Amino acid sequence: MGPSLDFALSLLRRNVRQVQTDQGHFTMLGVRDRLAVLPRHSQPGKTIWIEHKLVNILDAVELVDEQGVNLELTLITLDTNEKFRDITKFIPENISTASDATLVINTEHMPSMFVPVGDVVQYGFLNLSGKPTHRTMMYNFPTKAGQCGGVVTSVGKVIGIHIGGNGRQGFCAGLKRSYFA
C-alpha cells in the first residue's frame, strides 16, 4: 500500500472520529492528548457522542483571530482515558495551501469517506451564515451538507477543517500548529 493511502487511513483509525451534537453529524479531529477540534457550527454542548458513547467535554474554546474575528473552530478538551496520537507535527506552522488535496470525512452517514477536492487556495475572508470568518481556504469542488469537520489533507500534512460550501466550492478553516500548543 502507498504512503498517501496509508497516511489517510491511519488518520481515520487514530484521529478522525464520527460525532453527533444537537446540530447533527460531524467529523471531529483529535489532535493530541485530550484535545480535539470541531467546526464552530457543530455547537458542542456539555457532552458529545463520539462513535459509540457519550463523552463529557471539559472545556470548549471557539477560536478568534487578533481582531476578535471568528475562525470557525472550536477546541474541546474531553473527559476520556484515550490520548489521541499526537499529529500536531503534521499541522503547518502557518496556514498552508496545497495541491491535489484529499478531504477525509467520517460520520455515521458518511463513514471513512475520501473526496478528491483538488487544489486548496488562500481565501481569507468569508461570511458564514451571517458569521464573518478569517483564515479560510477554498477548493473548487461541490461539497455537500454533512461534510463539515472533514479533514483537509495532502502529502502528510493536515491543513484544514471543512467549514461550508456553496454548491460549487468548498471552504475549510486553515489549521496552524500554534492553535494546539
Automatic annotation (TrEMBL):
Ranges annotated as spanning the membrane: none
Superkingdom field: Viruses
Free-text function comment from the UniProt entry: Protein 3AB: Localizes the viral replication complex to the surface of membranous vesicles. Together with protein 3CD binds the Cis-Active RNA Element (CRE) which is involved in RNA synthesis initiation. Acts as a cofactor to stimulate the activity of 3D polymerase, maybe through a nucleid acid chaperone activity. Protein 2B: Plays an essential role in the virus replication cycle by acting as a viroporin. Creates a pore in the host reticulum endoplasmic and as a consequence releases Ca2+ in the cytoplasm of infected cell. In turn, high levels of cytoplasmic calcium may trigger membrane trafficking and transport of viral ER-associated proteins to viroplasms, sites of viral genome replication.
Family to which this protein belongs: Belongs to the picornaviruses polyprotein family.
Protein name as annotated: Genome polyprotein
Residues of the Peptidase C3 domain: 2-180
Subunit (UniProt): Interacts with protein 3CD. Homohexamer; forms a hexameric ring structure with 6-fold symmetry characteristic of AAA+ ATPases. Interacts (via N-terminus) with host RTN3 (via reticulon domain); this interaction is important for viral replication. Interacts with capsid protein VP3; this interaction may be important for virion morphogenesis.
Location(s) in or outside the cell: Host cytoplasmic vesicle membrane; Host nucleus; Virion
